[PDB]
């Protein structure tokens, strides 16, 4: 499998890299070395003080990982296991460092660590993909890392907000993102658990995957492109990445300090920057090795590999499903030549698709898988970048058309779009993932102004442009103004009725919007009717109430009367309280008259009730 990545920037630079690179290694070395502590017993995996610890090194790595190719220009030719990151990263909407998405990638340090000369025989790993013990949502963490965020990266476990962690989904408010229907979905598990394993959240949702993280860019869909989506929209705040440039070093220090003092609760001697430096080969070693065990394992549970094969892969791949997953066929093969196509489709769920669902070929499949890793890849890049692919030779025929008709599918899918329709959209707005994020934001006559977007068009694409279009008298632009200021047609819905006037509504059209027709009989005007309609569900209700409360904050008593039905010889007798609760009670009057004679006891000798 090849790894390689060249550097292009000054020596002075080169220098800069290697020294940040090899502090991220010494950071990461911390990581193995907490790790290895806590499975040394079960106390000591629930030592908290030593979870912290693991913690601050886990931080520690991810600010030095962020300072990576700071310039976005340093490296080029970024090849992690075949697959060039230089090319896929210039498609993506925001661009940004080959060098950093590559580190994100397990393994991907190896094709860095070439560029600044590190030697990989002394095992130079930089990872940042902690998972269940991560300080922070580990998804934000792997972003950060990808968008160099040198600053939004605490350099301590202290100095985690709950937002970037515990209550991540508050940080995500703050910065008024669409969020489409497959993320909303995500969420609801993250929310549950924000340390919840992207394969468990692709388990329970029935995906892939790849289809749960995305693409590492706004414009996709998935955690990743939700996340990138947030991150871009987040003012680089130059000052705090300073003090934790200044800061990290001696921090650093400071953590390998304190992993001596707590090391002496389970181990004879301490464990020393020495000791790891000595032992980091081997304790590595020793975890690619149960989890080429549990993976492998896992490959005939989950997708019946044989388990000769199982085993090779396990190897191949360094224990993990997630890279022999996004792997194409031709270098599974390469490197467990046992393998078929159907194992091969098993585990690699893009492949599968792209063979079962579109017919490709396996070569064409890998070709797609090579340059866009997955479909949610395809969704990320322009249209138009495609085509260019194409005609400048570096696409071929099959694949090319597979991509076409996968951009296509996401728009003309939606009922009222057509493909010429679905093509022009995806010309005037580069992809159908940035097409769809306008539709969420309400972008009405940005879309409308291309050729084939009708009403039809509109009414299936924008979110609640199809309920407030078919109240009469509401236009196209008021539309767009209301769903704009309110987010949407539900909390349009939830609107004020003094603000709704406001904004120009007649208040025919806020009755119907609020459907209190009914209510608005039952009492004199709008506002009223609403304040009715919060509390109680529907007129329906407010009838069943009792007579005390209709009358408190409410009006008159001949208006409780005619509200609850109450007969004129049923009134004319009792009072409001008894006569309302036999009616209730009996439903007719006729069957009033069930009750004794005299059990009538109430005012006078009402005679017509028995
Ligand atoms: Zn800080």
Request: net charge negative; aromatic share 6%; with cysteine.
């Amino acid at each position: 499998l090849v790894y390689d990545a060249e550097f292009v920037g000054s020596e002075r630079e080169f220098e800069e890299e290697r020294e940040t690179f090899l502090k991220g290694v010494k950071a990461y070395d911390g990581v193995l070395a907490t790790r290895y502590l806590m499975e040394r017993s079960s106390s000591a995996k629930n030592d908290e003080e030593l979870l912290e610890l693991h913690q601050n090194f886990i931080l520690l790595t991810g600010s030095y990982a962020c300072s990576i190719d700071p310039t976005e220009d340093r490296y080029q030719n970024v090849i992690v296991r075949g697959v060039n990151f230089d090319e896929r990263v210039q498609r993506l909407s925001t661009g940004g460092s080959p060098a950093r998405y590559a580190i994100v990638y397990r393994r991907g340090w190896r094709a860095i660590a070439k560029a600044l000369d590190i030697d990989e025989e002394d095992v130079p790993a930089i990872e940042v993909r902690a998972v269940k013990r991560n300080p922070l949502q580990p998804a934000l963490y792997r972003i950060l890392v990808r968008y160099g965020r040198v600053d939004l990266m605490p350099v301590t476990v202290d100095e985690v907000p709950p937002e970037m962690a515990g209550e991540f989904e508050r940080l995500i408010e703050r910065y008024d993102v669409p969020i489409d229907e497959k993320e909303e979905r995500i969420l609801e598990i993250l929310r549950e658990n924000p340390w919840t394993p992207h394969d468990e959240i692709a388990r329970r949702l029935g995906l892939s995957v790849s289809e749960v993280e995305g693409e590492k860019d706004p414009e996709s869909s998935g955690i990743y492109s939700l996340w990138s989506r947030v991150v871009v929209n987040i003012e680089y705040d130059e000052r705090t990445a300073k003090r934790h440039v200044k800061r990290r070093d001696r921090l650093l220090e400071e953590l390998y300090e304190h992993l001596e003092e707590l090391s002496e609760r389970y181990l004879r001697h301490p464990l020393t920057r020495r000791w790891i430096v000595e032992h980091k080969r081997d304790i590595m070693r020793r975890y690619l090795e149960q989890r080429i065990v549990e993976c492998a394992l896992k490959l005939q549970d989950r997708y019946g590999i044989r388990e000769d094969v199982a085993l090779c892969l396990a190897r191949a791949f360094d224990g993990s499903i997630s890279m022999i997953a996004t792997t194409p066929y031709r270098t599974l093969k390469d490197v467990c030549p046992d393998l078929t196509l159907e194992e091969a489709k098993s585990v690699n769920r893009t492949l599968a698709t792209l063979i079962d669902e579109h017919g490709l070929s396996p070569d064409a499949a890998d070709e797609l898988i090579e340059h866009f890793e997955s479909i949610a890849g395809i969704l990320a890049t322009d249209l138009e970048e495609i085509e260019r692919m194409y005609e400048e030779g570096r696409l071929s025929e099959e694949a090319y058309r597979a991509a076409v008709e996968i951009q296509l599918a996401e728009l003309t899918k939606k009922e009222g779009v057509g493909r010429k329709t679905a093509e022009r959209l995806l010309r005037a707005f580069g992809n159908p993932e940035r097409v769809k994020q306008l539709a969420r934001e309400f972008e009405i006559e940005k879309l409308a102004s291309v050729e084939g977007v009708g009403e039809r068009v509109l009414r299936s694409l924008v979110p609640g442009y199809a309920s407030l279009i078919s109240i009469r008298g509401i236009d196209r632009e008021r539309a767009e103004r209301l769903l704009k200021k309110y987010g949407g047609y539900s909390k349009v819905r939830e609107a004020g009725v003094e603000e709704l006037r406001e904004d120009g509504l007649t208040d025919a059209q806020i009755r119907e919007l609020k459907g209190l027709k009914t209510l608005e009989s039952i009492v004199g005007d709008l506002e009223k009717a609403d304040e009715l309609k919060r509390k109680y569900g529907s007129a329906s209700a407010v009838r069943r109430l009792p007579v005390e409360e209709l009358r408190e904050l409410g009006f008159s008593d001949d208006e409780i009367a005619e509200i609850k039905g109450i007969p004129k010889k049923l009134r004319e007798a009792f009072d409001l309280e008894t006569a309302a609760e036999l009616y209730e009670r009996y439903g007719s009057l006729k069957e009033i008259g069930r009750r004794l004679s005299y059990d009538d006891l109430l005012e006078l000798g009402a005679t017509p009730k028995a």
